[PDB]
Amino acid sequence: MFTVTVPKDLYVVEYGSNMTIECKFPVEKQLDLAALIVYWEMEDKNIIQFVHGEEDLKVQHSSYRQRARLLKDQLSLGNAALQITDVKLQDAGVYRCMISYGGADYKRITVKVNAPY
């Protein structure tokens, strides 16, 4: 059945680094962007809402504005890739990727941020 997978679901990151965290979803031949819905959230925070081919920024959390991006060129490979730039200690926690592409599924990713120098 349609399953979202996380071949890496643990990211131990240095403070102030950039990171890309990744969820896989099965794509047959050419991606239909109009059928795709990809959300990234963490705890009670909204990070990404990519809805039927277009990002919606209305409810995105202030802490993630300008730092959080979905890599659109990864979607056609069946890869939901969230880039966070300039990682903060408060970026530590459990992220979830929630995807509809015919089927519907989600997975959780653990992010740990090492203390700065």
Partner 1 sequence: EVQLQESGGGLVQPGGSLRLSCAASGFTFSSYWMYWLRQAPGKGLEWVSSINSDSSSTYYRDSVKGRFTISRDNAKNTLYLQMNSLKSEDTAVYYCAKDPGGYAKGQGTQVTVSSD
Q: How far is the CB of 77 from partner 1 (least distance, A)?
A: 19
| Whether 25 contacts 12, CB under 8 Å | no
Cβ-proximal residues to 72 (8 Å cutoff; 6+ apart), any chain: none
| Among positions 13, 27, 45, 105, the unique one binding partner 1 when judged by CB under 8 A | 105
| Residue 68 φ/ψ region, left for φ over 0, alpha for ψ in the -120 to 50 degree band, beta for the rest | beta
The smaller minimum CB distance to partner 1, of residues 77 and 106, is found at 106
Quick check: 4 binds partner 1 (CB under 8 A)?
yes
**Binding residues for partner 1 (CB under 8 A):** 1-4, 34, 37-39, 41, 49, 51-52, 56, 58-59, 96-106
